[PDB]
Amino acid sequence: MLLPKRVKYRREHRGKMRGRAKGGTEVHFGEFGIQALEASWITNRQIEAARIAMTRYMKRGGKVWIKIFPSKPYTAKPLEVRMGSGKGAPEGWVAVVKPGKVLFEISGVSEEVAREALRLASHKLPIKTKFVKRE
Amino acid sequence: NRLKEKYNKEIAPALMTKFNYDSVMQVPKIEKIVINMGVGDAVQNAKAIDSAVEELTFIAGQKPVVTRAKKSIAGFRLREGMPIGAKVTLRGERMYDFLDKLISVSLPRVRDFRGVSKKSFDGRGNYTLGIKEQKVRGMDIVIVTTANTDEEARELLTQVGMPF
Amino acid sequence: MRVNITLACTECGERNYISKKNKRNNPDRVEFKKYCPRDKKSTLHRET
Amino acid sequence: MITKTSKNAARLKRHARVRAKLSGTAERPRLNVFRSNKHIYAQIIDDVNGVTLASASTLDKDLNVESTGDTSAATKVGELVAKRAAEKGISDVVFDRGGYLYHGRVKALADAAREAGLKF
Amino acid sequence: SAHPSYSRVHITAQAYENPSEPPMFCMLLRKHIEGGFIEKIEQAGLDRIMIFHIKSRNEIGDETVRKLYVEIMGRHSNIILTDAAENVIIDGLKHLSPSMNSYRTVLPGQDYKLPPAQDKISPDDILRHLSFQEGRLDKQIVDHFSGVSPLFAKEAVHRATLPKALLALFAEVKEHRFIPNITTVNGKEYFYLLELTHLKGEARRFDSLSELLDRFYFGKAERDRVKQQAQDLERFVV
Amino acid sequence: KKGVGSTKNGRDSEAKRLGAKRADGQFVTGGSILYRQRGTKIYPGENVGRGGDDTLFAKIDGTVKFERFGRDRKKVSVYPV
Amino acid sequence: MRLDKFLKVSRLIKRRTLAKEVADQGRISINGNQAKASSDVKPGDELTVRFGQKLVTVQVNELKDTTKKEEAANMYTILKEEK
RNA sequence: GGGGCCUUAGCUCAGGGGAGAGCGCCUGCUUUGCACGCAGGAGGCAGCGGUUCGAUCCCGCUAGGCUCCACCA
RNA sequence: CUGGGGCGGUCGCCUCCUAAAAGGUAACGGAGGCGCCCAAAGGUUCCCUCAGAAUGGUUGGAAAUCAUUCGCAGAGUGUAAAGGCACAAGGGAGCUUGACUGCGAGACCUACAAGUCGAGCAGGGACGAAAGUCGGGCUUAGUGAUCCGGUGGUUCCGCAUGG
RNA sequence: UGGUGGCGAUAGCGAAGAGGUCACACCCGUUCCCAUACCGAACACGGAAGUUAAGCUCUUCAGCGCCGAUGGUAGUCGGGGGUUUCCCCCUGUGAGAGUAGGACGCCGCCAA
């Protein structure tokens, strides 16, 4: 459950996930990676689920290199409450994702193993994905 | 007026011949001397300033300047201001006279004097020194030179006869 | 304390000016020089 | 190791600090000064056009003397440049102590020009 | 010292440590005794009490006097300062209010008073007054004499009708014929004017009772503390 | 139903209508202001003056022109006919 | 302040409880008047007290609450004792 | 859940310039003496963050506790 | 006011974001500040340039003060933030009180009330040799109507006339 | 050469070299003007024995910094469409970044 240690503002606007990514569109730390085909917010619980999934499938395998970090916080008012009276309290932390963006990489491991692990992770994630490799 | 003429006549032709400088303007000399007292005890005893500032005066005829704080440190119970330490710059002839006086008296009169610290240079061509005796407070003095490297300063002071 | 003050002339007797001051740092009856538009001159003014 | 700044560069900074407040025009030009260790030079300028109008120096072959560097020389060159700016009948100027003091040779020169007729 | 178990008086080559803080009692002594003059010493009639008759000039150079009293009773020792003629207390180390419904009182201003001196002949008379059939008479020599320890009483009673021992030892003390030593009966280091009389303990003798006190208390000030710590830890470990 | 509150972030200052007030190539009268600001986003130039509020005004009549002090620094000026 | 608090801080009595107990017994008084633990006091007060037969008369000089040990007795003065 | 008060040694307390006053329980010592003591259990700002040279002392966020409120259909 | 009301919270001013590249723009939207301070922390003249780092060096210590090279700026700018400033608006020294009087072309903002800037003229001055700057402070907050009373001054009026 | 101004560092940083009889500097001493919170370092005052080392000028370079295209792409006014937390099509516009490359200076006035 990743966390930014320190932040300026505990409360931010949400934002808009228009367009494609700026960077991180291609694997370069590792060999076999995964990228997105949509745009969405992703949570520390999602990423750690995917991470531990692939690492359990691999059991010693090489290196991973996540390519993101949930910097963004997201609020949520308490339950059964009218509107207004200030912005809701923070709940967790979020990473924002554009399409064309690489999320997880892999090295030290064969292609079939990598593809299967990333499949497993994709099923923990909400969005549509693609298997990718380095050029 | 001893060490000026000694410097010129003995050192500079000899030293230029020794180092193969291009011109006499490349000669190393002392640009100045500086001395500091460095006493943060006045916070306790405000009278600790004129105490030994008078002594700096009786040492060097030039009046000193009380140094002051530039920041605040609760670790030493200090804020900006509160004059601590005292300084004297020195650039000219009583400079050399004072240095003659030092090498003649102050160095040997130390009750365990030996080969003084070979290495207390700054790696630039300028020397520093600390003293503890003279209340018996010492000081921190500095020699500043036109030497670019440091071995020429070494050779300079050796040829002066300042101990090592 | 920081407090209001008038600053009257001495030849004219007229008040002519106001300001403020610390009573701590400037306790005494302060004085400056200002222009008396009746005496038509720079002139020492005094606090009341 | 000790470096040493060029006092000329310092003088340039002080000169610029001055120059920020003024500039020489037609009918209010700038009178600039230079103070070599062996000479003293003076010029009069329309800073708008970037043009000198008149000039003077110890180096001038007229009135060659021994000092070229004391207040006497400063006075002589001041009166010279004054009559130059008289025969180019401007008579009204501004002064430019170029990062120097209005104390010594500069002061003497300026006083010379004041007496010769130039009005600051 | 009015320190209850270690309350005493002493002269020490070891000037231990003068404090950084002058306390109230110290400064009050400085007020009225500093630069003094010790005219006379007195024993308070052989009770564990002492008096210094002292002189000193007041704040106007007029000579004045005072009576410093040092009562060393044990757990309720104390140090008091008193006026000469008025007998009024001026200072006191352990102020003692009469909520203890006691005979005497400590507080300043009040007329000084001494403890109730018990009905004991301070110096054969025991064979007269006391019935030697009583047994355990090391207890009840305290009931006849003023200056007594159960140590002294036991060591004298073990000399076996023994008025001789009492009279001889009293003459010894009166003549200052004692021997200042420290005794050590398997630890439990004791000391007294007289030597050890019977027990198995080791003995180390001295030239000065003051040095005896020095070499005794200089350790016991902290040795016993370390022992307390050691035992408190040993309990936990066990 | 529940009960909540305490936003304590509910204010802001009155908007002060900064920026330029006259345009390049525009004719201007004496004393007209040109560019309200705080500090110097823009400096004065010829026949232009700065006030205590760091505001820029024309000392004369003329036409306005904005320029640059060499690099990364701007300027205004009034040039008459 | 209150009598019981005063007695504790002046260390005449070691427990405020005991002060209350004795005042409820009425063994003591103030200014010739029988008093209670809640009785108000002040400087200048003249206080009569009993300890069995030991009767006491004292005078109040000051009053506070932090009252370290030796500074307690500065708070007042003895005057007289009877029985 | 909201608001207010509080959260300093075992207990009770004071105190933007360096946390110190008193008291108690258990143990040990201790002794001639009318409960008159001593040492150790031990003496540590609820936490997090920030401003200041500095924070118990100013500010802010959160936790624990006490009190108040949590109403109309 | 109120995403029904009540209870809570807030009520005026300043700074930023939201704010959509002029300006302006709401919400019980997000973050913070003010109800002052300086008689020098102002004006003027002249002067010079910071924070931190590495070396050497008593007490000096990780950290005073010290010389030392590196060093557009990481510092400072009375205070919150934004804008801005190192040719100083930052830091020193000298002399002073323009933290003046009467005004004010013409502009900004604006429902009004009000608020803001302002060259330039006169009088008298301060600093400066001179040009020349000075009508408070680095700019933006630091404050409130009218009526009513009070104080001082006034070639105003003063119920027949003089007061 | 020196002085003095103008133009966005295409001017600078950095490395290597060359020159100084004139000139500019460095440099020699305080008796005076004046000064150094310390002092002739600096500022002032006077001087010219010697030094091109430094500064200053003239050459070189593209290591740093600086400038900077074309094309393409994102974005986007406008129009239109669609499975519309977004996406797509069309006329038009059009960056940044990354390149190509440029550049270790251009222009003036005075004095010898």
From Swiss-Prot, chain A:
Biological process according to GO: translation
Alphabetized GO MF terms: rRNA binding; structural constituent of ribosome; tRNA binding
Transmembrane intervals: none
Keywords: Ribonucleoprotein, Ribosomal protein, RNA-binding, rRNA-binding, tRNA-binding
GO cellular component: cytosolic large ribosomal subunit
Ranges in coiled-coil conformation: none
CDD domains: Ribosomal_L16_L10e
InterPro entries assigned: Ribosomal_uL16 (IPR047873), Ribosomal_uL16_bact-type (IPR000114), Ribosomal_uL16_CS (IPR020798), Ribosomal_uL16_dom (IPR016180), Ribosomal_uL16_sf (IPR036920)
Protein family (similarity comment): Belongs to the universal ribosomal protein uL16 family.
Quaternary structure note: Part of the 50S ribosomal subunit.
Role noted for this protein: Binds 23S rRNA and is also seen to make contacts with the A and possibly P site tRNAs.
Cited PANTHER family: 50S/60S RIBOSOMAL PROTEIN L16, LARGE RIBOSOMAL SUBUNIT PROTEIN UL16M
Listed name of the protein: Large ribosomal subunit protein uL16
Gene source species: Bacillus subtilis (strain 168)
Name of the gene this protein is made from: rplP
From Swiss-Prot, chain B:
GO annotation (BP), single: translation
Assigned GO CC terms: cytosolic large ribosomal subunit
GO MF annotation: an example: tRNA binding
Keyword RNA-binding: yes
Keyword RNA-binding found: yes
Alphabetized Pfam families for the sequence: Ribosomal_L5, Ribosomal_L5_C
Record InterPro entries: Ribosomal_uL5, Ribosomal_uL5_bac-type, Ribosomal_uL5_C, Ribosomal_uL5_CS, Ribosomal_uL5_dom_sf, Ribosomal_uL5_N
Keyword annotations from UniProtKB, A to Z: Ribonucleoprotein, Ribosomal protein, RNA-binding, rRNA-binding, tRNA-binding
Main function: This is one of the proteins that bind and probably mediate the attachment of the 5S RNA into the large ribosomal subunit, where it forms part of the central protuberance. In the 70S ribosome it contacts protein S13 of the 30S subunit (bridge B1b), connecting the 2 subunits; this bridge is implicated in subunit movement. Contacts the P site tRNA; the 5S rRNA and some of its associated proteins might help stabilize positioning of ribosome-bound tRNAs.
HAMAP family according to UniProt: Ribosomal_uL5_B
Family the entry assigns: Belongs to the universal ribosomal protein uL5 family.
Subunit structure as annotated in this protein's UniProt entry: Part of the 50S ribosomal subunit. Part of the 5S rRNA/L5/L18/L25 subcomplex. Contacts the 5S rRNA and the P site tRNA. Forms a bridge to the 30S subunit in the 70S ribosome. Interacts with VmlR. In stalled ribosomes contacts MutS2.
Protein name per UniProt: Large ribosomal subunit protein uL5
Species: Bacillus subtilis (strain 168)
Curated annotation (Swiss-Prot), chain E:
Positions of region (HhH domain): 124-220
Known outcome of mutating residue 47 to Y: No longer binds tRNA(Ala) anticodon (UGC), has minor Ala tailing ability, decreased accumulation of a stalled reporter protein
Location of region: NFACT-N domain: 1-123
UniProt free text on domains: Has 4 domains; N-terminal NFACT-N, central helix-hairpin-helix (HhH), 2 coiled coil domains with a beta-hairpin in the middle (CC-M), and C-terminal NFACT-R. The NFACT-N domain contacts 23S rRNA, the A/P-site tRNA anticodon and recognizes tRNA(Ala), while the M beta hairpin binds protein uL11 near the base of the bL12 stalk.
Subunit architecture: Associates with isolated or stalled 50S ribosomal subunits. Binds to RqcP. Interacts with ribosomal protein uL11. Displaced from the 50S subunit by thiostrepton. In crystallized 50S subunits RqcH is variously associated with A/P-site tRNA, P-site tRNA and RqcP, an E-site tRNA or A- and P-site tRNAs and RqcP2(YlmH).
Remaining remarks: Activity of this protein is best tested in a clpP or ssrA deletion mutant; ssrA (tmRNA) encodes the SsrA tag added to nascent proteins in stalled ribosomes by trans-translation, which targets the nascent protein for degradation.
Name listed for the protein in its UniProt record: Rqc2 homolog RqcH
Protein's organism: Bacillus subtilis (strain 168)
Swiss-Prot record, chain G:
GO BP terms: rescue of stalled ribosome
Keyword Lipid metabolism: no
Record-level Gene Ontology MF annotations: rRNA binding; tRNA binding
SMART domains: S4
Domain S4 RNA-binding: residue ranges: 1-62
Phenotype reported upon loss of the gene: Not essential; synthetic growth defects can be seen in double rqcP-ssrA mutants. Double rqcH-rqcP deletion strains grow normally in rich media. Loss of Ala tailing, RqcH is still recruited to the 50S ribosomal subunit. In vivo mild decrease in tRNA(Ala)-binding by RqcH.
Gene Ontology CC terms, in alphabetical order: RQC complex
Family of the protein in this entry: Belongs to the RqcP family.
UniProt subunit comment: Associates with stalled 50S ribosomal subunits. Binds to RqcH, 23S rRNA and the P-site tRNA. Does not require RqcH for association with 50S subunits. Crystallized 50S subunits are variously associated with an A/P-site tRNA with or without RqcH, as well as with P- and E-site tRNAs but no RqcH. Displaced from the 50S subunit by puromycin but not thiostrepton.
Protein name: RQC P-site tRNA stabilizing factor
